[model samples]
Target chain A: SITENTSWNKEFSAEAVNGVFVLCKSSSKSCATNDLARASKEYLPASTFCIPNAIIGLETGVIKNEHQVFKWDGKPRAMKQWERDLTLRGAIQVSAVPVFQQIAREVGEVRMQKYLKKFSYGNQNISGGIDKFWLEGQLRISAVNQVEFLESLYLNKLSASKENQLIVKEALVTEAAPEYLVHSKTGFSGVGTESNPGVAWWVGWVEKETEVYFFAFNMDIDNESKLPLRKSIPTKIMESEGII
Target chain B: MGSITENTSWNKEFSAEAVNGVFVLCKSSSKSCATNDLARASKEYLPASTFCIPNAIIGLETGVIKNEHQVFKWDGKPRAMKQWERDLTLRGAIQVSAVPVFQQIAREVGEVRMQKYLKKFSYGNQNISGGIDKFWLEGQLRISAVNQVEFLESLYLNKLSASKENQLIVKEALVTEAAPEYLVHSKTGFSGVGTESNPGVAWWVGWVEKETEVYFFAFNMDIDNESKLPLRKSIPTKIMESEGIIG
Candidate 1:
């Protein structure tokens, strides 16, 4: 006797997922800028939490005063919004993480920098001879390209590491259906310094048999409570779409 | 040269003057005059987007475009048009060039007759907004047809009919999938580079025929996955089954 257990969307006479990976975005208002700047490192991955010490300038009188220290379009890292003396890690700062400098010491700069073009297209504000970088700018990826990378890694191409692939899948995937497997990744970036509203991302793939479906979903995160959406949003989306 | 030496007078578009005696014509006799020499460079290059090609055909056939550059106006005076639509026009031109033969037509029309046609097609972007990506990212390319009570037949204005050239555009525009009752016809398009802010859109405007009458129905949305396929092919496809035209 074959023991079977499952419930399917009889109404879902359609495919369970879209073919491109889904990307979901949101932002947090749980913490204050000065505090978030001081705390994000402990809670996020280095790929994320890796911001230069915006707090240092705040502690030092050298950068005293702040009208929401802004990174004007072409402002030097040392400059401010309508003013100068950038003593802060408020919403208006930009994403300026110096990956090559930080990761280069571990993996040669060439290989590390190569990952930038391959992993995602992030626009960074390079100032101070790349010595002091801040996560004060912008970075993003397309749902399709993200799927391409994931697909390549799953197939072990793109020179991706089999070990890392296995590890990430193990850490993130959960089987919602006896016959289905879902892989998901979530990221939240930015807090309101200038009320940028920041961005949170939830993206991944669902697999069953021969069909591979990918999706990315994101929404405006008005506050910190929404940050948990990093884990729950995509799941609800997949369930609603009848994939799970 | 003139049908076996009848000494025909020169025609308006052509002439013959054997210059430098350089005529490389390889006529195969397979009683054997040629073989592999008949082959030239051949391979395949996938267009970054196939969607642009067919829509370019629609523009050309619709007379809404003379060339990709024929930026035009409709609702407003003929003298002005928005910068974004002009961009869509440029992209459309680049796509029409895919057909090779339409090149001259698009080029010849240029921007002169553009405005007049803008009013005719009127597929979104009429108000003129959003930097260059406005028409695409906003999903304002509101090209649709009402398929309310039935599928196929009712909507002539937003007909699912495809020109011979458009057939190539939606190479797999399958409208018959959900028609367990009967066959259906549909048209679709996608208008943005899939992204976080500007998710790629899928357009499915179609019709299905019932035993007693024809019904019109359509669907469009931002595609979260490639599954949208054509015409954002999947959404309307699944809908055809789940809706009044259910299999």
Candidate 2:
């Protein structure tokens, strides 16, 4: 005779973890006035920030005037019906923390900059040292290749670690601000945490002559807490290549 | 190729030839009675002077006797319609000369006698006495097998010289004295010269101090003119032994 036993017990817990690595390139060439404007128009929504400089100021907390604050444009514009519907549908579909959107935008900007640089210099006909305005003004140049490359690496290969490292490094290297960033703390707390504990991480970077900023954020929970920890020095001191 | 040669002087005789061989057997015990009936049947239509008596007969004459005279009756009654029809059909189908048909019928009678002898002890069951009657009753035994043995000598190795002798002897034998008198003077008007040229042949076997009659006929033109000859007798002799026909 054979008897079968059929009972089992298990325990589970939910938590969020994150890690960040950063690298910096000092004394990077700055875009010309026209290139900067074009880049700003191409990369950031005007409704979100009045100007690239103002957006940078807000991000660094340099604007003291509360009246200078900007709000996102939510009006229906002259776009195709399908485009409007797709945009609305996407907004309604997003459920994750807004911090992830911020990180995504930052990643998109770096990717676009890389794409523009490749388009301008990699062209056989374009001579080196041409006016940056002429290069940036070229219409129909595409950042689609860069976007697709990131999508392939991240989505197809499930290389989230590499994606995160690339995003953080891109931000640290290209931003006028300080230098490298390192994570100090991380956690996640949101609606889906019980089943899927989300990712969170912290980062700190400093411009030796200007200022230092420390930020701790959870992308899944939309929780962002930041602190200013250093005084401002001259732009020349921060401009030193090794200081980055 | 300038002109087609036309040899008009020579004559072309589109001729056909075939050889037919026959054998027959009769019931040994009833042959005397059977032959008398056969002769009587022949005379009723043929006239008594035309009938011949002998131990054996070969080439015979051909004639158109009334259908009734050719009818055969066994078991004290005329042959049934089916039997008559089968016989007529078999006669129509055979392709040998009349001499061969008569010879073959004689061989058939001899086989019938052999069957009667072999099955004689059956006493109460059904005595197999007459070959044709047995054939109609049993419908299984072949007449060729029973008479195959006695006919072997005539069929075995052909000594061409002996054939020439037989041709002359058979011709002289049928001249006027012995059996086969009906064919002596070309009664059918088709006989050319010698006995071999006669269109009919009488088939018989010696039994009870007299000749037992079997059958008589003429060849079908289709078979007579065919390149191939009728069945030879030697093969049947060997077959009869192997098939236990004599026993």
- In terms of lDDT, the best-performing candidate is 1
Off by over 4 Å in 1: A1-105, A118-138, A161-164, A174-177, A230-233, B1-247
Off by over 4 Å in 2: A1-195, A201-204, A208-244, B1-247
Q: For each of the candidates, give the backbone clash count.
A: 44, 16
- State the lDDT of candidate 1 residue by residue for B19-135, as single tens digits: 110001111111111111111101111112222333454455556454322433322323222322222223232322222222333344443342333334343223222322232
Best candidate per TM-score, number?
A: 1
DockQ, all models: 0.01, 0.00
Model 2: DockQ vs. true structure: 0.00
B1-247 per-residue lDDT for model 2 (tens digits)? 0111222111111021233322222332232211111222222111011111110121111111111113112233343233222222111211112232233343544554434532431211222333432322222322221222122212111111223222222222222111110111101101111233433222222111111112121111112221232222222223223323321
lDDT by residue (tens digit), candidate 1, A68-107: 2333344344323323322122221222333213322343
DockQ of 1: 0.01
Cα deviation in Å at residue B123, candidate 2?
Answer: 99
